[PDB]
C-alpha cells in the first residue's frame, strides 16, 4: 500500500500484533502502547531451514563489500523498476557507525551452505524529541531481503529479532521511515526534485519534457550561476562543530519530531566527508558562523540502459538560518551541487522547505515518505512540523 486509503482495505497479519496505533483511530494521548518488558527473550527467533543469523563487522573490507553487494542488487527500486539505490560502502559506515553503535545491531541473514548474505536489518541509537517528551530510541534502516527469497515470511522475522536485540539494551521505542503505508504514520512527507542536469534525466526517463517545451528552453530554464552569491560561505571544519551544534539545537525547538544531538553526534553527521556528506557554513565579517547548509550524496543505479548507468543525486539534510534567508542558502546549495557534478537535487517538504520549493524550480515528485514511531502513541502532525531527516 502506497496511498493511505488503499491501506484501509488491507488487513495486517503482523502489524496488528505490534504495539502501533491502528490506522483508523484518532490519537489524543501521548504515551507508550505497552509496558516496558521485565524479562527479554534470550533465544533468537527461528529462521527457516538452511539459514542462520549473523552479525556483520563492517570494519572488514570483505564483509562491507558483501553488504554493499546485497543492497546494490536487492534494495529499494522505483515503482516501474527503473532505478535502484546505490549506497556507497563508505556511506554505509557513515550511517551505520554513529556514536554508540553496537555490532549486534547490524543483523544479517546468511545461507549455511553458500555462506552468502541474503538479508539485513540495522539499528543505531538516537535520542528523539517527540512533542514534549525526549526519548532514547533507535533508527531502523536497511531492511533488505534477497530477491529470490522474497514473499516468504522472512521480513517479519527480521523485525522481531532486531526488536529483541534492542530490547536487551533497555530501549523500547523506535523511529523509522518507509514509503509503504503501515499503521500508523505520525507524518507524511512529499519528495520534491530540482534538476541540475536536465539532459541526462530526460534521456534516462527520470523526468519528461513538459507540456509545450523544447529541450533548449528546459536547458536554459534550469541553468544556474557559476559561483555562490552568499558572502563568506565556506566548507565546515573542526573549529565549527560547537557553533554548528548550537545553531541546530535552537533551530529545531520549533518542530515537534526532531533529534537531540550531542557535540560528538553533530561532528559525525555534519563534518564534511567527500562523496558522503557535504556541509557548508556562512561566516560573516565579524568571524561568526551564523548559517549553514548541508546535503548528502546518494546515487542510484539506472537499469536496462546501454549507455547511462548511475544517477548521481544529492539529498537535502539540515539547513539552519539565522542571518541569511533560507532562499539564498538553498539557491547556493543548488549551485554547490551543480559544481560537484550532481544530476538532480532532491528535498522533502518537511520543516520550512515548502517556502523555497516552488521558487527554486523544484518539481513535485510521485513518491511519499512516511514517518513512524514504534511503541509511542501520539497525535499525528503536519509535514511542516517534522524536523527529522534520515538517510
Amino acid at each position: 500500500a502506497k496511498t493511505m486509503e488503499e491501506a484501509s482495505k488491507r488487513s495486517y497479519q503482523f502489524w496488528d500484533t505490534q504495539p502501533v496505533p491502528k490506522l483508523g483511530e484518532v490519537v489524543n494521548t501521548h504515551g507508550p502502547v505497552e509496558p516496558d518488558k521485565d524479562n527479554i527473550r534470550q533465544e533468537p527467533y527461528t529462521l527457516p531451514q538452511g539459514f542462520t543469523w549473523d552479525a556483520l563487522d563492517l570494519g572488514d573490507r570483505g564483509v562491507l563489500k558483501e553488504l554493499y553487494t546485497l543492497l546494490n542488487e536487492n534494495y529499494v527500486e522505483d515503482d516501474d523498476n527503473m532505478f535502484r539505490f546505490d549506497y556507497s560502502p563508505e556511506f554505509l559506515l557513515w550511517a551505520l557507525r554513529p556514536p554508540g553503535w553496537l555490532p549486534q545491531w547490524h543483523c544479517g541473514v546468511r545461507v549455511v551452505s553458500s555462506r552468502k548474505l541474503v538479508g539485513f536489518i540495522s539499528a543505531i541509537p538516537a535520542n528523539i524529541h517527540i512533542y514534549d517528551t525526549e526519548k532514547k530510541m533507535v533508527e531502523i534502516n536497511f531492511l533488505c531481503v534477497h530477491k529470490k527469497l522474497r514473499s516468504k515470511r522472512v521480513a517479519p522475522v527480521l523485525i522481531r529479532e532486531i526488536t529483541r536485540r534492542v530490547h536487551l539494551e533497555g530501549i523500547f521505542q523506535a523511529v523509522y521511515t518507509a514509503g509503504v503505508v503501515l499503521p500508523k504514520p505520525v507524518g507524511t512527507c512529499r519528495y520534491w526534485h530540482r534538476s541540475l542536469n536536465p539532459r541526462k534525466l530526460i534521456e534516462v526517463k527520470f523526468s519528461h519534457l513538459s507540456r509545450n517545451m523544447t529541450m533548449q528552453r528546459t536547458m536554459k530554464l534550469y541553468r544556474l550561476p557559476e559561483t555562490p552569491k552568499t558572502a563568506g560561505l565556506r566548507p565546515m571544519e573542526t573549529k565549527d562543530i560547537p557553533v554548528v551544534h548550537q545553531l541546530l539545537t535552537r533551530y529545531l525547538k520549533q518542530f515537534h519530531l526532531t533529534p537531540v544531538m550531542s557535540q560528538e553526534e553533530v561532528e559525525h553527521w555534519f563534518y564534511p566527508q567527500e562523496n558522503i556528506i557535504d556541509t557548508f557554513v556562512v561566516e560573516n565579517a565579524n568571524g561568526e558562523v551564523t548559517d549553514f547548509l548541508s546535503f548528502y550524496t546518494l546515487p542510484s543505479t539506472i537499469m536496462n540502459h546501454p549507455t547511462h548507468k548511475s544517477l548521481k543525486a544529492a539529498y537535502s539534510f539540515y539547513n539552519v538560518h539565522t542571518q541569511t534567508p533560507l532562499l539564498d542558502l538553498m539557491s547556493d546549495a543548488l549551485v554547490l551541487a551543480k559544481m560537484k557534478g550532481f544530476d538532480v537535487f532532491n528535498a522533502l517538504d518537511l520543516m520550512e522547505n515548502k517556502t523555497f520549493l516552488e521558487k527554486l524550480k523544484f518539481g513535485i515528485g510521485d513518491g511519499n515518505l512516511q514517518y513512524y514511531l514504534y511503541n509511542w502513541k501520539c497525535p499525528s502532525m503536519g509535514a511542516e512540523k517534522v524536523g527529522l531527516v534520515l538517510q
Binding site: 522505483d78 515503482d79 519528495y191 526534485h193 532532491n346 518539481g363 513518491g367 515518505l369 534520515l390
Partner: peptide, 8 residues
Amino acid sequence: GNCFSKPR
C-alpha cells in the same frame, strides 16, 4: 531520502 520518487 529513504524511498524513491520521480518528478510527476
